[PDB]
Design a protein around this ligand. Structure first.
Ligand SMILES: Cc1cc2nc3c(=O)[nH]c(=O)nc-3n(C[C@H](O)[C@H](O)[C@H](O)COP(=O)(O)O)c2cc1C
Ligand SMILES: Cc1cc2nc3c(=O)[nH]c(=O)nc-3n(C[C@H](O)[C@H](O)[C@H](O)COP(=O)(O)O)c2cc1C
Lengths: 162, 162
């Protein structure tokens, strides 16, 4: 079955999709109201100090706000939160109809997610068509069981079966 | 159920584990033979140019080799490759008993994985107890179906159910 190609586009996207991920929504306080963006390019980076990374696309209108933000929060979604995922993708409702709750640092959050990491901006680097934002975790919130993540793999949403 | 804590250690590790991932092995040619390391801190970063990242721990004896390498390859494991995962973790056999196959750039590879990204070193940044290595994808190999990844979530290995 095995095939080899040089990445210079459908085939590369399919290949990268072979790496399973959770699903997050990264939020921040924008110039004119709350902002969020569905992300799966998140990674845990460091335990001491507690650091995480994620990559906003430089082709998004929200890139500047996330890149200039001092604080942002990463919400890890449970398998029952597909609708929350879809609010913060391309066509999505964003925060329209959602209650305004804020962290002490003023970041808009989504209660009821599997995990929320509230982060202070720590470092940022350009990486092609995306940036890499590294944040220091100031606070952690967990809710519910840890073993029912929303999983995205091979372009499809699904569950983890242990 | 919802609880909030400040990350300054068991609780933080459990929280970060709530983010589901695939499982990779990153390989390179070491000073005295092939090297590999099981990694789940991998992310797709950029399509144009094709870029990926992953984070080696700075507490590993293999960190210097990966950090100084010009070339390294990321192997995305299928659900049937737990043994390959375990070869390249803490106590593992590494390449002992495995056939030596090399890329044109001299990187030792593991045929038969779901995806292999052969990368040239592109950038590197320190991030606490880990480094962040960004590589430019020079070649991609895929084998078999794309929708049976080995998944690691909530500290357990498992499968994706779409
Ligand atoms: C499962 C999933 C994961 C995503 N991950 C990322 C990401 O890591 N970074 C990013 O900038 N956009 C990501 N997106 C896209 C953003 O949510 C984006 O603003 C929009 O959904 C995609 O369309 P657009 O690129 O045309 O705006 C993801 C979307 C989905 C469905
Ligand atoms: C599922 C899984 C994912 C891992 N991800 C990473 C990683 O992203 N970076 C890293 O440096 N080590 C990672 N490790 C650990 C390395 O494989 C490491 O050299 C060793 O397994 C863990 O023990 P040690 O930290 O005491 O050496 C992971 C291990 C497992 C089981």
């Amino acid at each position: 079955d095995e095939i080899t190609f040089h990445p210079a586009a459908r085939l590369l996207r399919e290949a990268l999709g072979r790496f399973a991920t959770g699903v997050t929504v990264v939020t921040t306080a924008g110039p004119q109201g709350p902002l969020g963006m569905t992300v799966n390019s998140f990674s845990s980076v460091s335990l001491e100090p507690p650091l995480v990374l994620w990559c906003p696309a430089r082709t998004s209108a929200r890139h500047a706000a996330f890149a200039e933000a001092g604080a942002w929060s990463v919400h890890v979604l449970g398998s029952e939160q597909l609708e929350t995922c879809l609010r913060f993708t391309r066509g999505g409702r964003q925060f329209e109809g959602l209650d305004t709750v804020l962290t002490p640092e003023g970041v808009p959050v989504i209660p009821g997610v599997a995990a929320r990491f509230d982060c202070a901006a720590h470092a940022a680097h350009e990486a092609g068509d995306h940036s890499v934002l590294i944040g220091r975790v100031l606070r952690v919130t967990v809710a519910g069981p840890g073993d029912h993540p929303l999983v995205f793999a091979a372009g499809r949403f699904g569950q983890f079966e242990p």
